[PDB]
């Protein structure tokens, strides 16, 4: 609809006169267009180098593409099932698929490992080796899907306000896995293993051509180093778990130490700036400051803003002559480089400039990432009155609450959106002496309403259009209170009497913005906690101040804090059913209890690194990180399970109980070191990124590598000792 | 049965080709945005009332209309307010995951219980029921540098020409035009009215 | 969904009604057959009639028990407070007045006034003050209704 | 009434108060001299009439 | 919905004056709880004999 | 069919366990009542014309 109203209604431009044109002072098309055009480029940079890194791995220059032709095809099945489920594409499914694209290649890795294990040590043709491959890969490939899907399948059942954001990180991601296992059963191991695989007696690794012949012997040295390191770690086996329990104690300590946030903001190229004046000020008294801030923004900050567009008469904090707001459009994303061109530096510089203004309470702010709810970040507090008590006592309650506002240590910069008591003029009439002079009352009401209420009489036609005709006096006879004495009304016998002979007036006070809530009147303030602190302690720190009020009134929570009071982050209820479903489901492969219970204990090893990776980066917890933990523990679990089943199936074949584990590490060390770096070498342009949508990309980039660096080089030292435990009888 | 993929290679090609075609046909028909529906429905109702205080607009035309705003499914709360230029919003929010058409028509049929209860001046202005959620999308409309055109005729050409083929397209829910259209303003003089022995009425 | 022919049936006869009928509203409800429960009682202190409790019920717990989930209808016993006036024919004949004159005097005196503002737009250039003006406010007590010039 | 007296005062004030509605194809409004008025509006193909 | 009604009654009733009270003279909700309790009491007392 | 599950007893157990856990989800994620919607829908109108 944006592209269907931005030029299809511009077809009236030939019908438009030459004295008018069209500009775009406010827009939102780049954050929806350039975001998609950037995420398709980062998908290209994702599957651009994953061909060349495995080309470095398997040393094949022509028979190389065969695990990477299915990969640009299976992502279309995600869009197919996404159209079948009827959910629109967003930043969410793109941010899911940019990490899902690297975890769906692992079956293509394991089938070319099944090819290479009969290509290296065996001279068998791939036609006779396809049956040997599928005899051992069908019992190992169909089991990972039910343990990988069960991290999102219980996560999809949770709804609420924070459930539609759990969707598109739900089953829409792992539907690509559920179709990739099907195309792994039906597509790769019959043709990609056989037809593009000649026999040249492959035992090379000495010359390799050009700048390539010094990798395979170093890889053999690293495999022998791992084989002697596991023999070194099986010596004592007591301090290697005594240092495991201390990092289990460190996980809960880091989890308590880190605070959380909720949906962090971006730059978006837009800024809002509202104005404020003391009451009674006219529209010119607000016009005297918007031109000054316009000249300031156009001259002193010319390296950041493209255009400004202010209005007056209307604001987010009410309306009238005491109001006004300004939209600010900055440079495009290729035109404002550097961190000083961000919205936060511009916001704090604007506030530092607005500190110099004396009689105006100008406030600038930036909208959050989500636009369809909330103008800014924070919380509100409605103040209901149950007994229906008057306006002045609840105004004094608001005054006492705003006095006990800046003293709270858990909150900062909490402000009202209303106003103070405006000095109004209350008129009074002496209808007894007015009737003694011989005037009525309804004619007096009619005259004062036509004189100052700016009445509307009927319709009239102009240029084929129906418009309205009003009726009012003149402005220069109504700007002053004694000018209100300049009016005359007709009595019963034709003559006129002035206004001051019967009617007078005085000066009282009254609020200009009266707000009701659930039938009763209610005022409110809005704020935010300290930078970094959550909203739970900020909620708990204000429910103790509500004992300091005139008793008879109560409090209420609404807005985006309403769902936070109802059901926010359900991390107690989360990570429990999802843990139990994989703990019951992973025993379907090994048909035991002690071995699945032992290999389940790798899930603490991967979660710890993503906690302190955020502290090393400098970011707080979010729902993006809350699904980043799920995908990295899924990656750690699937990187742990595919090596223990080989040891279990080869213990009963020809080996012992302690030797089969190190034999499985001796025979299957290649793909576990392959696919982990093959995944994370594409996430680096998303791990470090500055531009359109850089904050939400950073909200997932710094967690996924930290969760796996403690999972592919570290957890391989701990998984076989977990397998060969003495309780595993 | 199983193990039916070794013998027929291009039968294993065409099963990938048909899901590639099914994914290729899905891009041109699926709509593109950046964020789905997160906010609950936020059905707004606003009126205008010329030349009255906030206390008058609170004790006249919101107290008689918030007593009939009831009997509605999935009602969360009623965020209402009033201003000094005779404006008010009684925006009712609903539960998450609800089609807003019944939320429109229920508020409409409950607003029918108040339209004769309103005074005669505010009924000739026009009640407004909108499905606006929280925010705007774009603003347009500006004067050229040729001069001889103020803000008034600019607002009149915005209202009388542009928004009439614009407000009936897809995605349009609310319009917030800055400045009003043309009107016939008749300004009176109290000294001349006293001289000619006439009231304004 | 099934209210569609109900919501257009009202338009054929909404302004065709008499105006005193139209000043109450045609309440369209989804009441089906029965009730659920009843509440409301006097305490042991007494000092309450059979009208003030109904007035308190409809004034305090009407909207928090009707804006909730599932509530479709209510049929309260008693109603709110009302500023009732009981005319007498003897004193009316003594003062030679019709009750229509009394109703027009009430509907002329107890009127809210849309006055406006002192610094209203388009104001004169250089005006540095704006304030709303409050005219005749609605009456509050019974003696305020007593002090009405008939 | 006449055709102009039904064209200026009723259709031209209802057609301005009939916006913000979903799936509007077009509004073909017409009037005659004997006091008739039609605001027949078409919707998208395959929607719901009620 | 009945316990929601009793919650939104019990929350604000301290703000009512002390010369007032609230009872439930007619109610249909407790027979549902009594019925479902007496028929889940005929499940543990029904499967042990089988 | 059978005979793939007497030799795999824990794979025979896991289906009953996931059925029991889905039941433990559905016992709390379901509303209970006394009787279903037997009555037909009905729409009413009400006025009050005193005197």
Residue numbers in the entry:
A (entry chain L): 302 to 1030
B (entry chain L): 1 to 201
C (entry chain K): 102 to 251
D (entry chain J): 52 to 101
E (entry chain K): 302 to 351
F (entry chain K): 1 to 51
What does the report in the manuscript say about this coordinate set?
Tripartite systems of the Resistance Nodulation cell Division (RND) superfamily are composed of an inner-membrane RND transporter driven by the proton motive force, an outer-membrane factor (OMF), and a periplasmic membrane fusion protein (MFP), forming a tripartite pump with a contiguous exit duct. Archetypical RND transporters operate as a secondary proton/drug antiporter exploiting the energy associated to proton transport in their transmembrane domains to power the export of substrates through the periplasmic pore domain, 60 Å away, via long-range conformational communication.
Secondly, isolated MexB particles (MexB-solo) were processed independently of the tripartite complex. Structural deviation (rmsd 1.43 Å) of the related protomer T mostly concerned the peripheral of the domain PN2, so that the internal features of the drug pathway, including the deep binding pocket, remained the same. Overall, MexB-solo adopted a LTC conformation while MexB-trio is in the LTO conformation, and structural comparisons revealed differences mainly in PN2 subdomain of protomer T, and in PC2, PN1 subdomains and the central helix plus helix gate of protomer C/O. Before being assembled in the complex, the LTC conformation of MexB-solo prevents drug export.
